[PDB]
């Protein structure tokens, strides 16, 4: 693995520069090569014409047709927040979360040493969903929630995939990420957006782009309980954030 050798931050900035430029034919060419190599179902997209996208990023963050992702309306059901495949899921064994066969990671490591937040989730349940490059790169709410806390965590830009997940220790605990904590009818609920090499930009609908820039410090925002003025509520199935290049 050139995972420890490669200058992952400069490659990510290069892709971000690239993916942000409005280059007509070269933009449609890279989008078209991309759609071919990765097998993107453009029939699911709101705009299936690869010509409709001013920049590569506009395409990466492309919206879907509403009807092709029906939201389970049963209020007893929490729904999947992202297109892709499950990496691992199940019980949080005290503090231990499963990364892969014979790689555990700390709940407190994942939450950037936040022992109070970790305490909410000790012996709870986790789900880790992997977004492949072909998949839709916006993230939706699993259920209704009031946003209470958001924490930006500086980190590495390791690649995320079956290979690195199986071989890089503490991958999700050391990669740049945004922790979002909501109050729900199911108690406290964390939804964590973990960046990777190239696809390193994280946004939320309430804050815009969190990263870049990369200022190298932990930043914490809080919001009040649902009752109060200035509270931010989201519904099951509603967009909360996305990943783009840069």
């Amino acid at each position: 693995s050139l995972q420890y050798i490669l200058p992952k931050l400069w490659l990510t900035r290069l892709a971000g520069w690239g993916a942000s430029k409005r280059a007509g034919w070269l933009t449609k060419l890279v989008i078209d090569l991309f759609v071919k190599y990765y097998k993107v179902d453009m029939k699911e997209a709101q705009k299936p014409d690869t010509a409709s996208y001013r920049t590569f990023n506009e395409f990466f963050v492309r919206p879907l047709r509403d009807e092709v992702r029906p939201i389970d309306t049963d209020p007893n059901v929490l729904v999947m927040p992202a297109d892709g495949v499950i990496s691992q899921l199940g019980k949080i064994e005290e503090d231990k979360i499963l990364q892969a066969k014979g790689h555990n990671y700390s709940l407190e490591a994942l939450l950037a040493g936040n022992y109070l937040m970790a305490d909410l989730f000790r012996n709870g349940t986790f789900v880790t969903t992997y977004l492949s490059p072909r998949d839709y790169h916006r993230v939706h709410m699993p259920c209704n929630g009031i946003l209470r806390e958001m924490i930006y965590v500086p980190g590495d830009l390791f690649s995320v995939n079956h290979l690195t997940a199986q071989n890089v220790p503490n991958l999700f605990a050391r990669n740049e990420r945004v922790i979002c904590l909501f109050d729900t009818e199911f108690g406290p609920m964390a939804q964590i957006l973990v960046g990777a090499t190239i696809v390193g930009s994280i946004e939320t609908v309430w804050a815009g782009t969190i990263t870049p820039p990369r200022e190298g410090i932990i930043k914490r925002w809080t919001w009040p309980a649902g009752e109060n003025d200035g509270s931010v509520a989201l519904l099951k199935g509603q967009e909360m954030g996305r990943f783009k290049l840069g």
Binding site: R69, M80, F121, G187
Partner: protein
Amino acid sequence: XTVINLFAPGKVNLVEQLESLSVTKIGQPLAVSTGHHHH
């Protein structure tokens, strides 16, 4: 990339069919509440 959810102890049961490499689509069932809600 990746998205990680944390839920509190005894609050939800994950759909039993789901496992490593199971396909995910926005809106599909992920878990059922351990306590009953009604519309």
